[PDB]
DNA sequence: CACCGGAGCGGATCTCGCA
DNA sequence: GCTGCGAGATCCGCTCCGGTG
DNA sequence: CACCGGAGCGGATCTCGCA
DNA sequence: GCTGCGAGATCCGCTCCGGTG
């Protein structure tokens, strides 16, 4: 532990990873990793390997991107939760044409939110106003990050493959595109052999708001909750409603965190209802 | 749904019946650990019961 | 609360102790804001605790008298002589039962003593040797000596031991002396000490921060790494940082950042 | 981090404080701190208690606090009553105790000493210490102070300086749990008792005030006087004497007296 | 407390800016050269130097509704309400104050040389000399109210413990459904003080209509 | 900062009577209100005391 | 009735009929744009 | 009758290359 | 205040059925 | 005395980007 | 008759030690 200054000097001179230094001078690897963190050259030359994710979100939250196939502009519209897709060819990527396509889209379906990249048509102020005009949240992804729209990119690849497989069988490129839409919307099935269109229909049936509104008549009970650390709980903090009661646990909301949280039934006491 | 796993959202993990529906989150039963957890609506994929 | 306190300071220019007592921000943060603000520094340096030492001779008895600037807490003790070792013993007792931050003293032999200064650094508290120049300090310390002399002359007959009489005068001047809303020097000394300690507790415990280098992408070409800056809001996949060049909130994908420990040099 | 490790080594050689204490004081890993301690072969409400002790043929007056564990020590030539009166007057002046525990020593049983404590207003109790909780702490402090004096005598020129440094180490830097030194608990207790004093003093007010009611926006005549029992934001609570039930009246319609 | 009404008035071709406190009746006045917004802003600066107001009321006067005046007074940090005089509660007090101040100026202008001195003497008479009840002047009442609104009382209120309870509303003797639970603002005899969750208004309810919730055991 | 010297002196008076303070936040105007509050209670009985 | 902008109440408007009554607020018609508006009871002066 | 692949069923796992 | 995924192809783990000693 | 993280040790696992 | 791999960074599984009921 007394050789730590010499280890730091060697790190400054040569800049090897902490594992070798730990195995050599017998210093805990936490100290060596902190040395690497507090150094300069290794800090400047280390790489940020992170996993991140994708915005699957919920029902009716879609994103889109353009298609460059055979020097023809095509719009492909992709669902995230169920997996449905839809596409149509357009002469250009102009704002007015994009607005017309979006209006037809919103006539056909009932979306809620839309994601997109920094494309001029997507970013256009009139398009943003129209999206606001129909009460739909429009968020722009960070520029030069196709992984945000990786879903539409994957669907793009699959649709191009299906066009390659299906184009010579029909007279019209639009007809072939419709056939590929059928292939990837009704025929493309996996797992339980259920179409993305069927998933979307079932999602709409569940999302029907009449049942959700009328479920309010169910009995509501109150309770306290506490947090467990090393098996040692805290105080019974705050009265909150029993959102649902399960076997061995319930569902509660913490106003401090403003998010949903689960507590085992052992740390829960039931409040009797009015009588 | 997906959990944190090694880091960030992980890969999809099994089918399990939804216990209750809320706003922005639902509750599922973990098959591996047999504990109830809260999962945000951003990482759920609703499926018909069969 | 800290940015709003900074706005209040650059608008009205009160004292750091004030800004602390209203906005609840750390006292160190308030003092840093005061130092950064040019208005408060152009025209008028003592922290929470600052001490001044002026020896006195009452009834041909050498007494080491301690006075504090801001709160005004005082300490006295009779000393046999003006020897540096005796002042070292008295000062180390003073440090035993006090927690000073800074100290000022006259050109006395003990104050100038090399071994005394080495022991003062041994304890690790700032010290200055020279003629006091601050009118606040001068008026306060002269008033303190005059009041101490009056209290000694007023209280010595009733107590047998001279040390006991000095002790009773210290009682009267520290705990029994009281004014305003019931504020005594020892009360406010305890009080400012407790804000200090809770501030270090909060700063040590509550805050968990990271710094990072960042870059920008133009035409697909990564830019040169600049900064570093402070991660104001950490999130999964992306981070929110302030660009020093533009003073604007920005969002950068995690593939273009490197995580750095905050303290760096500090 | 590394900038503080050799420094911490150095003051550990100076003072011989506790591993976790220096850990929390300097942000240095506790494993390193305990290795330092093991390597150092040198180391290896306002209620007060007193027990005389002898060290190097020198009687030392020791004050032991029951709750915080704060201690005060000073060299005394003997156990004589007048000498203990002098040190106890200095003690009462320089601290603010509330109650004291003591044994049946002559300097404690002395009538003049007891009269002095009564004049100063402190409660003096004489008797054999029976509480195991008090006795274990007392013996721990005695053993620790003798050990630390043995540690610190060679470096310090003065025996009184050795006691002063020992008191510094035992009450200022030596910390446990959340790093709260017994001096810190003492200060916290004193500030808390001041807090309760001021809070109760503002509690016994229970003042009285006027009030009036509002009807369809038209004014009602002033009523009262009634006690000021609770005051919320924008309104307070007053008693309606006619109906024997309480009212809530806005601040603009309440005349306090 | 700290609620004030502003109304322009003219006496002997001299504009007097009168400030009336609705609760304690405390009054301040000063000779005003003109009803200009800048002069009113200067007068409000002087009055904020004098006092520590928290709320203010006035009519639809141009100086009061001026955007610069509104910005300056919100920089001071006070809420503003303007409109046609509608509330008898404060209008009767305002009219009585105007009549009394006119009478006192008429009484005291001969004895004093300067009109400013005369109005200062009238302010003295109305604020300090005039007393009511046990001999409490409006300025005494205002000072006591200012003393009673300091932080250490709500500090004790925070220190105090609070309980939970149910409540129901009775119409024509018919009890309603038990509602809440809400905080018990302050416990009393036969009744307690609560707040309606819908109308957000402080409500008192009898203890017979109160279901006290036991605390955790 | 202020347009008028009268406004400047008014602000200085405000800040000396309120903003500048000491101890537990005891400004000169606050302690003046305090000793007036103490004086009034005894002055009520000073009518008989005189 | 009067409207509140960024928390600041506007000048009183009317007189107008009460359209639809609710809990703690009333519905009134805007005389300018000819649209119904919801106004809290604290921002409404009932005319008897 | 135990034992191991055989076949069927289901799931686990690999690179790649789309923008 | 934000965010890589899924068609496609062999191999294998496996479970009733088989040959198989 | 059982129990769970705490810390240390060791291993498991992710993208990426080099030609 | 030939051929993607490994530095680097967090997380986690875990085991003696710890607080902990």
From Swiss-Prot, chain B:
Q: What does this protein do?
A: Catalyzes viral DNA integration into the host chromosome, by performing a series of DNA cutting and joining reactions.
The name this protein goes by in its record: Integrase
Q: How does it assemble?
A: Homotetramer; further associates as a homohexadecamer.
Q: Which residues bind DNA?
A: 1-49
Signal peptide residues are none
From Swiss-Prot, chain D:
Q: Which residues are listed for Zn(2+) binding in this entry?
A: 12, 16, 40, 43
Organism encoding this protein: Maedi visna virus (strain KV1772) (MVV)
Top-level taxonomic group: Viruses
Q: Where does Mg(2+) 3 bind?
A: 51, 103, 139
Start and end residues of each Integrase catalytic domain: 45-190
Query: Could you tell me what this protein does?
Result: Catalyzes viral DNA integration into the host chromosome, by performing a series of DNA cutting and joining reactions.
Gene of this entry: pol
DNA-binding region, residue intervals: 207-257
Q: How does this protein assemble?
A: Homotetramer; further associates as a homohexadecamer.
Where exactly are the zinc fingers annotated as Integrase-type?
A: 3-44
Q: Which residues of the full protein are shown?
A: 1226 to 1497 of 1506
**Protein's name in the database:** Integrase
């Amino acid at each position: 532990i007394e050789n730590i200054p010499l280890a730091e000097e060697e790190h400054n001179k040569w800049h090897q990873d902490a594992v070798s230094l730990h195995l050599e001078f017998g210093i805990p690897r936490t100290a060596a990793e902190d040395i690497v963190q507090q150094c300069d050259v290794c800090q400047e030359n280390k790489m940020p390997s992170t996993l991140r994710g994708s915005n699957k979100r919920g029902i009716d939250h879609w994103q889109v991107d353009y298609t460059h196939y055979e020097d023809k502009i095509i719009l492909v519209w992709v669902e995230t939760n169920s997996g449905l897709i839809y596409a149509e060819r357009v002469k250009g990527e102009t704002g007015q044409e994009f607005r017309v396509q979006t209006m037809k889209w919103y006539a056909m379906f009932a979306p809620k939110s839309l994601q997109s990249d920094n494309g001029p048509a997507f970013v256009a102020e009139s398009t943003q106003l129209l999206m606001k005009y129909l009460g739909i949240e429009h968020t722009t992804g960070i520029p030069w990050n196709p992984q945000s729209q990786a879903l539409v990119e994957r669907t793009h690849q699959t649709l191009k493959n299906t066009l390659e497989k299906l184009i010579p069988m029909f007279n019209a490129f639009e007809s072939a595109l419709a056939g590929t839409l059928i292939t990837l919307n009704i025929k493309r099935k996996g797992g339980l052999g259920t179409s993305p269109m069927d998933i979307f229909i079932f999602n709409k049936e569940q999302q029907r708001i009449q049942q959700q509104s009328k479920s309010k008549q169910e009995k509501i009970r109150f309770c306290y909750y506490r947090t467990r650390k090393r098996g040692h709980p805290g105080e019974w903090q705050g009265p909150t409603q029993v959102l649902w009661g399960g076997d061995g646990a319930i569902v509660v909301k913490d106003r401090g965190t403003d998010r949903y949280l689960v507590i085992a039934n052992k740390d829960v006491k039931f409040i009797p209802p009015p009588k």
